[PDB]
From a paper:
Additionally, we solved the 2.7 Å resolution structure of a variant of the LMCA, LMCA (CDRL3SAR), where CDRL3 is mutated from the wild-type 91YGS93 to 91SAR93. These mutations were earlier shown to be critical for acquisition of autologous neutralization by the 13C antibody (Landais et al., 2017). The progressive rigidification of the CDRH3 is further illustrated by the crystal structure of the LMCA-CDRL3SAR. Here, the entire CDRH3 lacks secondary structure, indicating an even more plastic structure than the early Fab. Because of the steric barrier comprised of apex glycans, it is unlikely that the LMCA binds with CDRH3 in the collapsed conformation that is observed in the crystal structure. Rather, it is likely that there is induced fit where CDRH3 adopts a more extended conformation upon binding that enables the acidic residues of CDRH3 to interact with the positively charged apex.
Here, we describe the structural characterization of an apex-targeting antibody lineage and autologous clade A viral Env from a donor in the Protocol C cohort. We previously characterized the V2-apex PCT64 bnAb lineage from an elite neutralizer in the International AIDS Vaccine Initiative (IAVI) Protocol C (PC) cohort (Landais et al., 2016, Landais et al., 2017). In this study, we combined negative stain and cryoelectron microscopy (cryo-EM) single-particle approaches with X-ray crystallographic studies of early and late autologous Env-antibody complexes to decipher molecular details of the co-evolution of HIV Env and the immune system response over the course of several years of chronic infection. Comparison of Ab-Env complexes at early and late time points reveals that, within the antibody lineage, the CDRH3 loop rigidifies, the bnAb angle of approach steepens, and surface charges are mutated to accommodate glycan changes.
Author numbering:
A (entry chain B): 1 to 52, 52A, 52B, 52C, 53 to 82, 82A, 82B, 82C, ...
B (entry chain A): 1 to 27, 27A, 28 to 94, 96 to 212
Amino acid sequence: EVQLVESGGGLVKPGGSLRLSCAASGFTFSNAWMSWVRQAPGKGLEWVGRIKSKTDGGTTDYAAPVKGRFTISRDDSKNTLYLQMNSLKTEDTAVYYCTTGVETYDFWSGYDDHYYDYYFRDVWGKGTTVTVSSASTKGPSVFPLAPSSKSTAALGCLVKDYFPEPVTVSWNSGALTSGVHTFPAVLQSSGLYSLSSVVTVPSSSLGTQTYICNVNHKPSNTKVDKKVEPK
Amino acid sequence: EIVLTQSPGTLSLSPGERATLSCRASQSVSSSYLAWYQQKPGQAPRLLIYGASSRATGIPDRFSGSGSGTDFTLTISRLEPEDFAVYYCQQSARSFTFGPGTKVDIKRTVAAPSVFIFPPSDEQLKSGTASVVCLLNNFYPREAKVQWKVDNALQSGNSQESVTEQDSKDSTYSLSSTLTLSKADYEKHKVYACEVTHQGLSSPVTKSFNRG
């Protein structure tokens, strides 16, 4: 079908460079104005840049936070888009989608004739993730957030000082799922991530039920099962 | 470059209600260059409307677009459980810019947060750092204020908070704030308090603890 597949994203040092590629399929790529659009973690959509078709002159435009460091090119013989990123920053850490934007009104003529007479569509990719930091791979540290001896009760596990994302947290090997809140990770100033997973259970249950949090980190291949009990 | 603003920042409604989102442009935008996109968590943006008023193929009929050059409007006639997401307005005239985004969340009655506080474990203490956790469980709306205090001294710059997505059953939010200190700074003081200010609370609720 019609699709855009991004590739090339990964971990880059704050001073390094990286080339993202975007393969197009299913439509006449040479006639479409292409664009790179990024989205930082927990933030909105940010337009990185745009390149026009060879017919319209191939003029390229960039956003202010990106102008002077990023370049965009296209290979019509390969139906491929390229984003060369030089002098990266931590602020450049985001998911980079390759999109077509809103093309001309009659861009999709002939597209699916059995079903449609007039057709309009934009194309987006699944996006590629670019992480820019000076940190290395580090196993997570699981600390038990124990229930209050004062006293419904709440307990949990704090997963601190790990890199990179993601980390999976379960309770009693998935047996406990009600009242469980796994919060989004937070990037510390040291370049390491930290999150916390809490669960609220009846106080009496605290005396008759064992609670074990299971933390799995794929990059470090770490599995830590820690029990949570009052102090 | 034309700047796009969206109103309101957050829209709280229930399924089956009429949703109205306004996009304001710094300068007059040609109707053929404005679009409305919808994005859901962990998913690529989905083009809802192109050309201010035209509807993309496959988009349900409840999404409608209107507007002139400075003011535009995206209207959802009747909200569905799948229509609660983030909505952006984009403009292709002049330069390619997005809007701030309007979050549409399920409306429910005001619920006060349940405040809990967790001191650092002894393992983390011997590790060399102290992290104090403050948990605000099940509240609405999402707006909430957390203030850390160390022997009545208000803190700043050493706390980081994160909020969960809206619950499917409760339609409430949960917030977790972490205050990070060194072992020496943690052993210097005694009382540590977390003060919560929320719409569902008459007075800010404070949860404190002492080492021991």
